[PDB]
């Protein structure tokens, strides 16, 4: 059970990142889980399964990152709440 496919990686990543932020108030830790996963997407899809994942969920995940980056400048936690609304939508669809 090593998470190799993108939906597997995002599912375990979003679970862990939410546990850090909502469970433990650890914004830094949340970002340390998420930033690498977004960077993986930004490298681009390499396989067919990555391509179809990207077509389904790429826009939503990209927008969640923009809300997080809004938070980085604003400091307004409501912007992280927006991001988590988008991340939860992805999480349910890949569960």
């Amino acid at each position: 059970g090593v998470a190799i496919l993108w939906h597997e990686m995002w599912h375990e990543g979003l679970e862990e990142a939410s546990r850090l932020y909502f469970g433990e108030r650890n914004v830094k830790g949340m970002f340390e889980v998420l930033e690498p996963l977004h960077a993986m997407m930004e490298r681009g899809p390499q396989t067919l399964k990555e391509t179809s994942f990207n077509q389904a969920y790429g826009r939503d995940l990209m927008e969640a990152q923009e809300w997080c980056r809004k938070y980085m400048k604003s400091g307004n936690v409501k912007d992280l709440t927006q991001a988590w609304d988008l991340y939860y939508h992805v999480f349910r669809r890949i569960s």
Partner: protein
Amino acid sequence: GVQVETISPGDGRTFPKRGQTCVVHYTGMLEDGKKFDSSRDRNKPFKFMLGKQEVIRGWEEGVAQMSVGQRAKLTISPDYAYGATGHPGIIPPHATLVFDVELLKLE
């Protein structure tokens, strides 16, 4: 703890078993009445699985005793919500919360 007061009745029969996802509409507000979150305002219900510690204790115990179609006022103690830490930038420390929640269906 949590106090459940029925606003609108459900069927009084279909209660959520563990394993099922509860689909709800909610409106969360502080003790004074100021809203902090509402699924109704977004026009998109909230889905979550019960008894997995997914949500705050007031929901875990409160929503468990609701029937399908029921709408209720959940007054939740701070130790049954976010406690001393709170939820930074939304819910402060030692906050009594009030949720107007409607159990729409189970999936």
